[PDB]
Amino acid sequence: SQIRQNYSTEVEAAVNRLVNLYLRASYTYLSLGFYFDRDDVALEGVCHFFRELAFEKFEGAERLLKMQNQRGGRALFQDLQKPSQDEWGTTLDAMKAAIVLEKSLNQALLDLHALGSAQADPHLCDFLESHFLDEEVKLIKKMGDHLTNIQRLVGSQAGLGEYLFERLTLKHD
Amino acid sequence: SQIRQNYSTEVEAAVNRLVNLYLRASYTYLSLGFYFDRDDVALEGVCHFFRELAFEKFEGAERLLKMQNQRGGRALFQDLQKPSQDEWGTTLDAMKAAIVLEKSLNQALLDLHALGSAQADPHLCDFLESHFLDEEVKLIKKMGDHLTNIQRLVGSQAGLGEYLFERLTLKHD
Amino acid sequence: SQIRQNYSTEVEAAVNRLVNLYLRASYTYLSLGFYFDRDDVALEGVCHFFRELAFEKFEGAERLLKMQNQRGGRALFQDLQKPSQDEWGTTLDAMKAAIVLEKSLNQALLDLHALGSAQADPHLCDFLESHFLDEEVKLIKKMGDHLTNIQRLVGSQAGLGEYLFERLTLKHD
Amino acid sequence: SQIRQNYSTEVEAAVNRLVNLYLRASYTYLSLGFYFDRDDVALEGVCHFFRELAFEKFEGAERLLKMQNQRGGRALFQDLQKPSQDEWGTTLDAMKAAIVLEKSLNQALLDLHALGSAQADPHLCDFLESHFLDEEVKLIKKMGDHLTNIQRLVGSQAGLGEYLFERLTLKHD
Ligand SMILES: CCN(CC)c1ccc2nc3c4ccccc4c(=O)cc-3oc2c1
Ligand SMILES: CCN(CC)c1ccc2nc3c4ccccc4c(=O)cc-3oc2c1
Ligand SMILES: [Cl-]
Ligand SMILES: [Cl-]
Ligand SMILES: [Cl-]
Ligand SMILES: [Cl-]
C-alpha cells in the first residue's frame, strides 16, 4: 500500500472479523425487530428498539470498513451466520439475549484495543475509544436498566407488565 | 465588623450549623439520586427527583452563606457527615427517609426563627419566612402526597406499583 | 452486576475516592468564594472565580458518579473533610492554595489513569482523557497565569495591585 | 378615623419621626452628591452614587407616608435639619459618614419594628420587613464592601486610589 503505516496484519484481520460480528449483530437485531412486529407478539416499542439497533450495528460495521480503507487495509467479507434463534420469546428473553450479544461485541472491542496497544497502534486505539467503547457502555447500561424494569413488572401479571413496559418506557407511535 | 448590627453571636453560629445541615441534606440527596440511577434499581424519575433536591438544598446553603456575609457574620464550615445509608431500598423507603430529613431541616428552621424572635432580629426572621419556611412546607406536602400514592400502589404487586409511580407521577425523559 | 464488564474493584474504589476528592475541592472553593464576599475582603471577581470552581468540581464528581453507574460499580460516599483554612488571606494566598489543590486532583487523575492502563480498562482511560485531563491542564495554566499577574502587581502597593487584578482580569458585574 | 384599626398613636408618631429621618437622609445625600460634582472634587461616580441614594431615601419617606394614610394615621411634618457637614472630605470620609447614617436609619427601623411587635401590629412589622429591613441590610453591605476597597486603595498614593475607585467600581458616564 502507498498509504499503509503502523498498521499490522493482525489488526487488519481482527478489524475484518469485527465487521463480521457487527453485521451478524445487525442481522440478529433485524430478526428480533420483526419478531416483535408479528401479529401474535405485537409490541411496537420493542420492535422499534431492536430495528434501531440493527441500523446502529450496521453503522458500526460501516465505520470499521471506512477506517480499514483509511489505514490501507483490505476489507474481507465472510459468510454472515444467521441469528441464534428464530423466535425470541418474551421481551425479557429478548432483552437478555441482546445484553449477551452486546457483551460479546464489547469483549471483541476490548480484545482489539488490547491488540492495538500491544502493537503500538494509537490510531486504532483512539478510533475504538472515540466511536465504540463508550457507545457500547451506554447501550449496555440502557439494556440493564430495561432488564431491571422488565423484571420488576413480571410479578404475577406477566402480560400486563410486558404491555406496560412497551407502552410507558419504549418509544412508539 | 464595620457593618454588623443587631446580629447575635448565637444566630451567627446557628446559621453556620444550618449551612452544615443543608449541605448534609444535599449530599444525602446526591446519594439517593445516584442509587436510583443504578442499573439494578433504574427508576429515572426517582433519580431526577432526588438530584433536583440535592441542588435545591445546595441553593439553600448558598442563600444562608450570602446572608451571613450580608449581616457581617463569618461563615465557618465543618466536616460534612456522609449520608445515613449507602443503599436506600424502595422508592417508599427513600421517600420516607426524605420526609424524615425534611422535617429535621424544618425543625432547625423553626428553632432558628425562634432564636431570632427571642433576640429581636426581624431581618433573620423575615429571611427565613421569605425564602425557607413556605418552601419547606410546600416540599413536605409534595412528599406526603407522593408517600400516599406510593403506598396506595403497593398492594399485592409492589414492582408494578413502583414502576407506575415513577412513570406516571415523577418527571422523566 | 448484569452489566459490569472489565471493571475492576480497584478502579471502582479509586473512582469513589476521586468523587470524595472532587466534592472536598468543591467545598474548598465554596469556602474561598464566600471568604472573598466578606465585607472586609470584598473582591467580587475573586469570589465569582472560586464559586464557579465550586460548581465545576461538583460537576466533575457528578460525571464520575454517572460513569460509576454506567460501568456497574457502586457509588460509596464518605465523610467530606472541611477545607484546610477558615480564612484564605490575600488573593495571592488563595490562588496559591487553589493551584496546590488542583495539582493534587491532577495527580489523583493521573494515578487513576495509570491504574486503568495497568488493568487494561480503556473506557476508564478515555473517560479521564476526554473529560478531566485537559480540563485540569487548562485550569492549572489559567491559575499560573493569574499567579504571575498577581505577583507582578504586588510591588510596593499590594492593595492597589489586588484591586486592579480583581477589576481588570477577573470577571465581575 | 373610619378605617383606623390596630394602629397605635405610638406607632403613628414614630412613623412620622421616621419620615423625618428619611427626608433628612435624602437631604444629606443631596449635599454629598453635589459636593462630589464640585470642579475641585470632580468624582462623577461618587456624585452619582450619593444622588441615587437621595432619591432612594425620598422614596422610603414616600412609602412611609402612603402607609400612614393606608392605616388611618395622620402625616405630620417637622423642620428638616441641614446635613451635618458642608464639605465631606475624601470618598473614604463620605462613605464612612454614609455608613454611620445608614446604621442610624437601620436602628430606627429596628426600634419601630420592636414597637410594632410590642403593640401586636403585624401589618407594620411586615411592612418594614418587606420594604425596609433587607433593603437597608443590602445597602450597608454594599457600603462596607466599598469602604474596604477604598481603604485598600489608600496606601501611599491616595489620589490615585480615589480616582481608580471612582472609575472602576462606581457607575459613571
Ligand atoms: C460542598 C459539597 N456539596 C455538598 C454535597 C456540594 C457542592 C456544590 C454543589 N453544586 C451543585 C450544583 C452547582 C451548579 C449547578 C447545579 C448544582 C446542583 O444541582 C447540585 C450541586 O450540589 C453541590 C453540592
Ligand atoms: C422635602 C424635601 N426633600 C428632601 C431633601 C425632597 C423632596 C422631593 C424630592 N424628590 C426627589 C425626586 C423626585 C422625582 C424623581 C427623582 C427624585 C430624586 O431623585 C430625589 C428627590 O429628592 C427629593 C427630596
Ligand atoms: Cl449458524
Ligand atoms: Cl457519619
Ligand atoms: Cl479535616
Ligand atoms: Cl442642624
Numbering used by the authors:
A (entry chain A), B (entry chain A), C (entry chain A), D (entry chain A): 2 to 174
Sentences reproduced from the published study:
As a scaffold for aromatic cluster design, we chose ferritin as a protein cage platform with a 12 nm outer diameter and an 8 nm inner cavity, composed of 24 subunits. To prove this concept through protein engineering, we focused on a two‐fold symmetric inter‐subunit interface of a recombinant horse spleen apo‐L ferritin (Fr) as a target region for mutagenesis. Herein, we present the construction of an aromatic cluster with an artificial molecular binding pocket at the two‐fold symmetric interface of ferritin and explore its ligand‐binding characteristics. We developed a system that uses ligand binding as a driving force to induce and propagate changes in the orientation of multiple aromatic side chains.
